[PDB]
Each structure stands twice: as structure tokens, then as C-alpha cells.
Symmetry: C3
Amino acid sequence: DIKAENTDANFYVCPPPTGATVVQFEQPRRCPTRPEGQNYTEGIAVVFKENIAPYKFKATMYYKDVTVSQVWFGHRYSQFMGIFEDRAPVPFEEVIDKINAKGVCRSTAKYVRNNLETTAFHRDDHETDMELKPANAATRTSRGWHTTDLKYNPSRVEAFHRYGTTVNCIVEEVDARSVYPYDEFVLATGDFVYMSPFYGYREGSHTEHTSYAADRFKQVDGFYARDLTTKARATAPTTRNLLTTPKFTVAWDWVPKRPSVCTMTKWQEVDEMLRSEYGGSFRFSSDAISTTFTTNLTEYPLSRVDLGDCIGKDARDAMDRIFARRYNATHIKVGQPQYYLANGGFLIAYQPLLSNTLAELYVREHLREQSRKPVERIKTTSSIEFARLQFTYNHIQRHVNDMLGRVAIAWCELQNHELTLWNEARKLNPNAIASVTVGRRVSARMLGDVMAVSTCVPVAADNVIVQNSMRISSRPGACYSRPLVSFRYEDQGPLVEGQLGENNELRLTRDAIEPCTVGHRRYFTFGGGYVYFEEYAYSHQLSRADITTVSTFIDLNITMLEDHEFVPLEVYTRHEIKDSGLLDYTEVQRRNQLHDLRFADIDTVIH
Amino acid sequence: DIKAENTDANFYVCPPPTGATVVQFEQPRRCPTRPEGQNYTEGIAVVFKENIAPYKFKATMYYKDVTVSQVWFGHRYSQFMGIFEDRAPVPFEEVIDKINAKGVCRSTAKYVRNNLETTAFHRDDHETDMELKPANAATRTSRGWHTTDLKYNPSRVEAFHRYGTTVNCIVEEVDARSVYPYDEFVLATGDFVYMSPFYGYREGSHTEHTSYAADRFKQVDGFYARDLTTKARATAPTTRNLLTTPKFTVAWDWVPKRPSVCTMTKWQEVDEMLRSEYGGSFRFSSDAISTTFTTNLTEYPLSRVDLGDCIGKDARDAMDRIFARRYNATHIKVGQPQYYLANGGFLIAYQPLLSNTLAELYVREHLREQSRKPVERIKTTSSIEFARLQFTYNHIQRHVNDMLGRVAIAWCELQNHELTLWNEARKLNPNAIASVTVGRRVSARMLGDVMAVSTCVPVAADNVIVQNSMRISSRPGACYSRPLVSFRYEDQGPLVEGQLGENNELRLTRDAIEPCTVGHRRYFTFGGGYVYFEEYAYSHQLSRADITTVSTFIDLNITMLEDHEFVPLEVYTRHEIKDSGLLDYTEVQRRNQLHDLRFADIDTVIH
Amino acid sequence: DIKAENTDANFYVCPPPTGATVVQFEQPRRCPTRPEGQNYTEGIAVVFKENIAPYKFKATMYYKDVTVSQVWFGHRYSQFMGIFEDRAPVPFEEVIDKINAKGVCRSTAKYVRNNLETTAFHRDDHETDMELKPANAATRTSRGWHTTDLKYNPSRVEAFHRYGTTVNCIVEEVDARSVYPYDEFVLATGDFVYMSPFYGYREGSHTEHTSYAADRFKQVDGFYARDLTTKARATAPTTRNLLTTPKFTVAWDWVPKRPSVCTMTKWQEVDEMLRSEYGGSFRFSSDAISTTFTTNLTEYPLSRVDLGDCIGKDARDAMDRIFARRYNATHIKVGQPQYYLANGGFLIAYQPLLSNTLAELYVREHLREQSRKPVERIKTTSSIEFARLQFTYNHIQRHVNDMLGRVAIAWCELQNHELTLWNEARKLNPNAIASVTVGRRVSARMLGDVMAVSTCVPVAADNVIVQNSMRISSRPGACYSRPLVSFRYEDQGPLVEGQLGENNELRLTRDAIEPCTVGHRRYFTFGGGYVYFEEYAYSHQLSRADITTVSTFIDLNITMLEDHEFVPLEVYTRHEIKDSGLLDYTEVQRRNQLHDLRFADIDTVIH
């Protein structure tokens, strides 16, 4: 007769439970604990990296240009038979006496060449004084001075061969380099000198190239140079080396070798560096830098380091400086500065810091720090980046776990408390609770604390019918609150008496009756929709859609983090760098090699 | 007699609460709000980086090889007294007239040398000027041409000296380079020329120190060159500079200095660049690039930039181009392009974009953009990476906070609503609720809205006993639903009457009785396990394990993100790159450096 | 009379609901599912990068120094008329016979020069054999040997010109480098040679032409060199090329061209490399490396690669090696090694791995792998970093989504179950539940399953009054549990009878009465605070603050991840690299280029 409007829903019948099945609720679970916090030491660190260093210094050169020329005189014309050009060293004596003090130089050159002592006279004059003047201007040049502008050719005699001599004294300032602190350091030309800026009265290597009298090398102590141009005199003395090579004499100031070089560089200063002890290793993270470094716990011998006085020198300087500014009132130092080597070959100097508040701790901390305290070069990697990645990675990870962990605990605790609610709740409606718990529809009743359960049998939607009239003829004055129904499990046959219950439960028995009333209008969950009864009478059927909905649940909107691709990005390619400067190794090289071909002709061979 | 099987659990007794303690539930808490969303402007940006680079151009050289040789004739043999080789400039006139137009060149050279005008006649014959032909093939060479293959020497006359002269005209192409305008640009030799292609009356440069003799430099306007090889004539005129140096004459095309030079490079184009305003700074993020840039709000003066016309030129080009493709229908431009300088020294040009939909906004946006609008070089860092890190970091952070924040709100709201459930729940069972809330077992009853509470006293597990028979002799026909028990607080003494309650509560009074029934089987929470009663009679005891469990709680499985280590990774070690820069190392490096020493003559002196 | 102490709270009245409004609870929502896990293949990979490579090789040079000098004898003194210096090739025959086998050289030189065959004799007397002896020491040399220490000038005769000739045999290892795979290569001396080891003698190269007579170039097969110094004989033969240039003869060992040069380098080995198939691309992630690579699915032709035999050679070597150590028992290989090209131009060789457990799978996997299997150089980027970023980014993202996703499901499930609790709960107190659900105060009653609702009307705090005495005169022996009140909606007028209800509900009707009792003390929610009644009598009023609070809610503390800034950080910067060097490249170049300017002598031109 009246069949459910809405097919979609299902129906169940639930026989009363018996002994046979019983179950218990789980008791509250133990909760996770938040991890002990990591402890961070405060401190100041400076970082050092490996360095080049070249050797660079200044020098002066004194040499003279000796030229002799031959001329043949033709009737109309003249021709050069040949021109001879030499360089002559200026003597130690001449340099000091003539050039340096006076600034005046001598025209004539007297030097050994080819195991012969040759002499030249300028402009075959009487020996005369010459006054040096600065060299003609050129861009990007060092200073230089020269006596003689002009060349001297023999006076004209017809049909004769003649020789003429010129001398030009030259002095120049030199930039000197030593690729390897060694026998040789180089001149502007790249003309080599076998001498060293370092030496130096005393050295082990003193032996190395000396089986000697003085002879060539001479040192003046307490040398005061005077500027040629200014003719100012040096305020302070130096030790002046002069080496006389056959071509020329060079002079420079002597300085002790060791302090000159030294290798290591002080990359950066971190006001706040944190040291962490994890994993049997140390972490130093610079917040600003956003780098983290990993080091062994043990400290790194400075003594091991070669040439590297500087490191201590710098380290204290920065540390002292930093402490005063930021630290001074605020914090107290613990222990003395410490050095660690970190992957990437960065050397870290650390100065642990203690807060004033903490200060009582100071004794204990000091002891620990001290225990840490215990020639090769250190190689450094070009790329920081890994440290930065480490820095970034850890921090983010730090947050994620921390926040998530809290949630988990919150979740767990929430569940435990909730159980209390559920316990009572099941009491009110064992079926509803039982069904949800099991996850299937079931019938249950409480036996004592424990709850019995039995499963329910589905009934076809098709086979359900609702009775038209709630009210009871037999015993008037009473009306049953809920509808009655008929149904059967299988299609073919029998019809079963029964009545409706909450959530489409067909209860076999029709116990529950209430006093009749007026204005008695109700809705019942029937099938997909609701069945509508009015005045204990059948009305129409509805669907859920008709009725406005409200939601128990609290919404959460969670979205994924979408994927991203990182494409190779570089300011510079390898090629670009090579191209960059200067300009090209390749371009230059191609040009240079070519040079002989274009300019000079080897080629011609003839039978 | 009947003692609990399962020790593990505890027992409590809970006396009824009095006035003395009362507590209230907390009221719902205020919830966090989701942050206002960040606003992002759309736009198109191009990025620029610093670049040096130096200047190159083509040039041609005309010079002649003048050689004179001496021979002595021995009886059998001949020997060279000596060979003289010179270069002679080819005259301006000769170049234009002879070489250029005709392509023919002449044997004879006439130039000043050593303040003398010397002349040479090639292969001393009454003069001929044959022609030029291309130079012999070489790899990686520029073009060149030369009149004379062979060298000429005097005919043999015995026991006499003779002189012979040769002339070979040479013309060559080849590249020229000028780093920057000053003073000289370089020719192949490593010799220099100082002329400037660059200037230019309309330039400062003329001022720079000048000799100057008029003659040497000459400019031809409306020059049409003809290719020597092809003998094609140039379609279009150029301005041809020729400079005659004593060695040679060089010619090239004059070009205005400025447009050639200039600097900064257009690194990349971003179709979609987002500008964000945070922190009193700007963020530009390129999604594809995955870089973010930080800039000051204020714009960066282009005028400040030195040599840098290009930037505008490029910027518009890209922007216009980009807009049409992607943007054209879709979006409308706002304002004119804007430039910002970002850390890392990247210059960003930005063109703000507006959507069509938004367009009404357009007036307002325009005003804001405009307000932004307000010689040095800009230095750029090699490494992008920090920006990328920033890009990566922010995005991830963005997600994490966003998602988490939502959860927190959801959590909060959930709690508030839950309170409603709890309020009723406590009503049903004040003890259970009260206990959980307090976190200890307590007894409570409701006085009005407020709930009173009192604490409970633990009872020893050992001292508890259960009565065998539920049923009551005295008043038959009634049976007590729950078991009765005896217990005492302390070991030694007295026994107390009492009965069981939920969760091992020993209630002093034994009120609650129900009608007797059959099939009355129940479980009670007793100690660790359950006590089993059948038919109002004692049966056996059980443990919890025996009974299958169901769980209220909804599981969550949360796992930590495990630590990771980043080890230094590099494609290239520094050395390898240097190795790449040709070429490598040690033995050669040893050899080369030495060169001056050995070749310069140490060996000895003869007095 | 008695008005609320605490203003802050509001009051409501709730008329009974009617038909007019009804609502339903939402049914449980479908839950999200956890994504299918990604599948990862295990495998071993090696990575390769692009390489430079240069050519370098050893050489030997044999040449002689031929010098002739002229002297004029002055009365006292002597002078050099001139000195002639030449280099003479040492003959093929001489080298093999004399120098190589004997280690002896000859005084005389005989070579063609200037199309004349000149000869020189040393010491002019006539021949005696000369043993070679090592050259004088210099630091950083290659080896060399020379017969003759000293130079010769003719015996003195007065007023005569005389000639003297000197010959010094010289041999030197020298280093050789060649830019190009074909002929041209250069000495350490830097003189160019046109020859080359490079070509495998049978090669394409034969066609490539330099054409000459046979004599100059000769090859010896089965050459055994003997060390000059040691005078050891070579154990094993080589093929010895000798080229005789006019200046000198050079010899080196011939080797096949191709294998020498070749390309790509084997960057790294990854024990565990994971391949992932996503996005129509492959991901290889190295855990240790913390890089991820993206590749096309298809494999990359090795054959395409130019010079690159090595790759296979290395790849197998590592793979075989790796497998045994880690893999050997543990895993089984699938298929043969495979190669992919990844962005960044890294070539990846992959060897898929299968576990033993899985092994049944083996057939299927093999088929898939095989299907993948299908002259240019590959360019590689300097910077890994993007891959690392990708690696980092993905992993973190992986965690975040995974964990969060779980939470969402947990949340959803939790809500559904909770609904069960709510359903019953509303039953107990429809108003409280209804109000919360709606979010405003409302009145509701249950009609059947569905709940009716109506809204409530706020009442002024001001207009509420409480009745002093609970107890009822009329019917003594009964006392009303809750207080009675009077109120009115608006200020001016009427007073309404009513009574208190939970949460400041003023119920119009005063139904609910309980038996009178003693010790009847209660609290009622009144206004902000509580009203206190004792013994069914009015006492005083309180505030909430007075009473201690307990909280239902489970706390969560969630904090944001704070922003971070990454500042540009570079251990290595472009300038520093360029500088890095001794003295330094930039400084070199500026100085070097300058050289002509300062040194060169125009100096000036005059008539």
C-alpha cells in the first residue's frame, strides 16, 4: 500500500542480543610526551677560509741603457751598419752615493760583460754631471727617471764608418711578485731575479744558494731613501737590499718572511652563533647567515695549522670587539676562545657565552668547555650552499615536528576524555553507539558494565510498508508514538508484523505507546526521506532535501602543498665566466699563438 | 573469601560531596581568526646583471717588409755578414690609390726611420709593382696578402761583400681590441697603437694630451673598400680611419663611441613576476625561476646608472613582446615600467598588470604606482642561491602556517561545541565526568548549575571482598542489580560494609535494588578484570583480555620527519676549473718560471 | 528589588517551537583516502659531467748552439765586432746513433740554412767525442744536457779580425701542449712545431694534408730510449716520432689520437639511487647526495655521445664493484645498465635493482626496463644547487602533505562518530544543542526524529528581577527547585511573570516543583555571576570569578614558523676568484698589457 518514497536508504531489524557476543571499550591510551628541548649554547664565532696568498711587494731598479751605433755615410744619405744595445747595472756605490743622496747620476757605465770589463762614455763628452728627470708621461705606469733623452750618433764624416755612444741612466719603480717564495721573484717584464725579498740575514735556506763572498748582494741597514721627485727624505729607516744582476741592479726593502704570507682569511663574523650538540657532532648555526656547520666535538689544533698567526690575532680582535658592543653588560664570557674545523673546511672560532642570570652555572660550564681543548693547509669548498641548505632544512623540520607533535598529543588526550562521554552515551542508546563502534548495524544491550551485541539483518527497501493509522481501535484513548510497518526479508513470501524504530529499525514488537494528544505531528525517518504523520494519521512522505540542514561537524579546510619544479638557474655559465674576462683565455690564446705566423716568415725553403 | 583475581586495578570510595568544594566549567574561548590574505600584484619583470665587457673591432694593416742582407763570398761557401729587417708604413696615398683601388702594390718603400728618410727598392730592378696575392694557408688565421715570396741576395762575387735588398708588401686583416676607450688599442704584436676609433670631436677625448702632428692621422669619408680577394667593391660607404705609425699603417672604420660600449646585461625574462609588499620592502617572486628578490619600496634611478641605455631598450622590448603574447586580451597594463634594485645587485624592471575584471580599480592603482617613481656601476653577486632559498623557504612556510592555523581554529571551535555535550553528560554521571575533569577520582553532585565535588579515598586492592549472593533473604522477590562487597582502608583491622559501583567504586550504602528476574547475567568491573555473576549468583572471575575490545577513539598515525645531512657537494673543485684554464700544471709550471734564470747567463765570469 | 549583580550576561526567553521551523542534522560525510604510495625502484647510478680536456704530452728536443764571434784586437783591449748565434737541428741519424745509443754527441753541426748547407766545427781543432752532461741546476727545470760549457773567441792577433766558432749540443725534455687534436702543438719553450703525436697513424688524418719530402719526418718503430742520466735502457719499446725543424729536432712518443682526448668525466657514484616515475619524467634522488634529477623517460643514446668510451668503462666498473660490496647477497640486478640525460646536463647511468624477496616479479620488471632502451658534446651546468633544492623541497613537501592528510581524515572520521553523541545529546536538552548548532539561542523540541526550532527574544539585563522566596505559601510542603523572576522586554512598561531556567532562560511557565528538603543549597546561573540561594531562600549573589574553574577542553599550543631572511652569502665571489692567484690575474693583465707603453721607445721624432 504505502511504500517508501525514497528507495535509497536501507532497513534493518535488530533482534535482542544474547550472551553470545559481548565486547568492551578500549581504555585510554598512554600519551606521547614532548621531547626534551634542545639546549643551545650562546657564543660568538668567526669563520675562516683558505686563501691564495700571493707575494707582492715594491722594488726599484737602476740600470743604464748603453747603446753604440755604427753609421756609414753615403754621398747623399747615411745608413746604420748596426746598433748595439745593452743594459748595465748601476753600481752599489753609485746608487747610494750618486743617485740616492745627490739624485745626480753619472754618464758613464762600467760593467763586466762577457767576462770583459767594458766601459761606455756618454756623448763622448767630458764626464759631466747629469740631472735626472722623470720619464715622459704614460698611462698606468710606475715612476721612472732618465738622464738622457737623445741618442748620440757619430758626427758626419763622409765615406767613413764611425761609432757613437749613448748612455741613458734609467731608474724605475717595480712591482714584484713571487709565485713561489723562492729563489726567483719577477720583474715587470717577467724578467726574473734570483733573490728573495724575504732574506734576511738568517735563514736555513741561507745556505741554499750561497757559496759566497758578498759579492753581488749587499744590504744596507738604516737606509733612508729620498724621493727623487719630491726630493723628500724618508722619515724612517729601512733595511735596503740591493741585488746587482748583470743586466741591472734592483733594490727593495727587506722584511721577515713569515709574517708576510700568511694563508688563512677571516671570512665573516657572527655576532650570535649557536652551538648545538647532536649526533656526536656540533652544530653551529648563524641565524643571520642562515648557515649551519657541522664539526667534530674535539677542537682543532691551531698548531697544526701552518702560517696562521693571523687567525688568533683576528679572532680575538673580533671577539673582544663584539663582546663589548652587544655583550658587555649583558653577558659574561665562558672560557677562552676555541677553534673547530667544520666540513667545507671552514675553521670556526667559538667563544661560548653565559648570561648573567645563569651565572651560577658558570663553574660547571667552564670545566666542560676546557676539556674540549686538545703543519698542514686547510682546503675550503667554494660552495657554502650545503650549509645553508642544512640551516634551512633543520629549522623547517624543527617547526614541523614540534607543531605536529603537539597536535598528536592533543589528539590523544582528546580521545581519552571523549571516551567518558561515549560511555554514558551508549547507555542511552546502545544500538546507535554499538553500531557506530562496530561500524556495522548491530543490536546491543548492556549486561552490567559489559555490553552484549548481536548483528542485524538487512531488509529490502522494497519490502517495507507503513500502516496508515497509528491510533489503536482496540484500546482507544491511547496512541502509539511511532508508526507500525510490515515487511519481509525475501521477496516471495510471508509478511511480518513489526513497527518502525529510529534509523529505519524495524522492531518486531510494538510495545511503546503514549497517551493520545492533539496537534500531534511528527516526522519519522523512513527510507531515504521522512514519513509525515499528522494527528496520528498518515499524511505524505518527504525527502531529506526538503528540510533544511544544520551540521554538527566543525569544518576543516586542508589543502595540499602543490609540487614545484626548480629549473637550472645560473647568473653565470661556466662559459660565460671564461668569456667574461679578460676577455677570453681562448680568444687571447688564439691570438697569441698566431703571432709568429703573421708577423714573421719562417716559411721559405728553396731547393 | 572471594578476593579479586586481578590485582592491578585500584578501588575507590566516594563520599557524597558537600558545600565545601565546588567548581565551574570553563566557558568557550575566543577563536583565532585567519589572517588577511596577502595581496599580490601581477606584473612582468626583466632582470639585469652587471657586465664589464671590453671592446673589439676589425682592422686592416698595411706595412712592408724591408730587408737588406750582407754576404761575404768564401771560396767554397758563402756567409751572411748580417741581415737587416725593417717594417715600413705604407703611405696613405699609396694605400688608397695603389692598393685599394688597383689592388696593386709597389716594390719600393719610402719612409722615415731614425729621423732619416730611407728608401728601399725591391729586388733592385727598374721599378715594377706587380700585384698582391693571398698569403699561404694557415689554420686559424686572418686574411693577408703579400707581393713577394722570395728573398733576394746579391749575386756572388768572390772575395767581396755585397748588399741586397728585398721588399715584400704585406697587408693583413685581423682583430683589434680596446678594453675601454683609453688610450691605445692593441695590435697583434703586443705592440700597441694609440689612435681611437672612438673619437670624435664630439667627445672629451680630443682634449687628452696631444702631440700633435697633423699628418699622421687621416680620415676618409665616403670610403668604399674593395675586397682584395673577390675584388668586389663595397656597396656602402664607410668612414675610414687610417693611422700611420712608423712601423705600419692601420685602418679601420670609425664608429661613434657611445653606442658601442655599454654595460649591464639582461639576465632573464619572467612572464609572471609577483610583487609583494611586506616589511617595508618589496618581494618579487618568479614562480618558474623560483627566486624571490627583496627590494626597497623606492624605485632606482636609471639616470644614476652609467652606460645603460640598453636596459630601457631591452626592457620595453621584452615587456611589449611578452604582453602581447600572454597578456594581450587578458590583461591591461598599469602605469609605465618601473625599476628596482634588489639585493644581489640585480636590477629589476617591473610592469604592473591589472586584470580586465578588476579594471574599475585602475584609477586608484595607477596613482599608487606612479608615486614610486622618484653615474655608478652596479655590482652583482655570482650566487643567486640565496634568493632561491628565500623563494623556497617562504613558500613552504606559507603553506605550513596556513594549514596549521586552520587546524588550530578547527580545534578551538570543536572544543567549544563539545562543551555542550559535556554539560549534559556530567548531569548523567557527575562522578565520571568530574573525575575526568579533575584528573583524579572524585565524587560530585550537582547543586544547581554548579557542581560540588569531594575527593575520594583509595582502597587497597587486597582489602576488598565480594559477597557471594546478590539475592536478599530478608525481602525475597527483590534482587540487587549490583554486587555487594566488604573492604577496609588499612590492613590490620576493621571490615566495612559496602557495595560495588561503576569503575570500582565502593559505595557505602546499598540502596539500589531491582526486581528479580531470570536469565539475569551480568558483568561487573571488578579489579583488573570483570566479576561474573549468573542468575544473581557468583560464578567466576575474568580478566579484560578475555573479552574482545572495540575502540571509541579515532586513530591518528603521525610520524616525524627524520633528520637529513647535506654533505658538501660540488660539480667542480676550484683546482679543476683552474686546470681547465689551460694548462696544467706542475712540471710545466716548474719549467716555465725557470726560463729567465737559465737562459740568462749565470754561469761564471772571467776576470 | 533584587537585580542582577552582574550586568554583562544577557537573558533570553524561549517560546515553545511550533511546526513552522524544523531542521535536520547533516549526515556523515565521505572521507578522503590516503593516496596510493609512490613506488620507488632501487638501483645504482653513476653521474657524469662534461670535461675540458686539454692535450699535453712529453717531448724531447735536440738542437745545437752554433755561435761565431768576431773580435778586433785593440792595443790594450779587445772588442767584439759581432756575434752570430744559430740553432742547428741534430740529425735523425745522429740522434739515434750517436746520442741515443752512445749518449755521445759530435762537435760539428751540419745543417741547411738560408738554402745553403753550412757547417760548423767546435773548437776548430778537429773532432774529439764529447760526453753529454746534465745542465746546471736551476729550480723548477725540466732535464737537459749539454756538451760545451764555454764559448770561444779567437786567439789574439793584434790589428786583425778573427772568427771563432763554438758548438754546444743541447738536449732538453721540454713539455709539449696542443690546443687542437691536430697538428699544431707548442713547446714549453713555446716555439711552434707543425707535427703531432695525435693521429693514430692509420686514421682519417692521412687525407688531411701537409705535403713534404719524407726526410723531415721520420718514425722509428720499436724504439727503445735510454735515459741519459741513468743510462738505463727502456724496458719497453715505443714508437718514436722525430720531426726535424730547421731550428731543432723534436721527438716524442706517438699515440693514437682518439683515446687521448676524450670527454665526459665520472662525477660521482651513488650506492643507493632511487628512480621515481612521475609527471612523465623520471626522478633520481640520491639520499646521501641529497640531489634529485629529472630526466625524460626515454634513454639517452650513448652512440650519440662523442668520445665517451670511458663512460661505459667506468660505469660498469663502479656498478660491478658496488653491487658486490653492498648488494651481493642482498639484491639481484635487473636488466643491464641504462643511461639517461638529466637537466643540468648530467648523464646518469642507472642499474635497476630487485630484492630477493620480490624476485618473483623479476620477469615483469625486466620487460619494462628493456623497453626503455632506444656525435655531440653535452654541456653541464656549474651549479648543482637546483637539484639539491628539488631534493630538499620534495622531501619536506612529501612529509607535510602526508602527515597533514592523515590528520584531515582523522578529523573527518572523528566528526562522523561525534554525530552519534550529539544525536542523543540533543534529546536530553534540545535547547542547548539547538542553540549551539544554530549558533544563536533558540528553542526547539523534538517532533519525531526531526527537531522543530524557534528563535528566542533577548531580554534586557536591566529588566530582570529575582523573587526572594522559592517556597510556595499556597501549597506548603513543596518547594520549587529553581528561582522565579520577573522581567519585561522593553523599559517602560509592563512586568511579566516568569522563572529562571538554565543559562539565563526565562521560562514563562513556572511548572517545575520538587519536594521540599533541608540543606537545600544551590547555585543558579544568574546574569554574569551566580545567584546563591540557601534553604529555599535568597542569600547573596556571586560572580563567576569567585568560583574556581575547570576546563573541558584539551589545550593545543600552536605557534607560527617565523619569517627568516637570507642575505647574500658567498665564500667565493667572482672578483676574489679572479684575484686569487699570485700575484694575481687582474693585476697581471693590467701590468702586462702596459708593458709596451712604458718601455717602448718612440721616443720622439725629429728631423
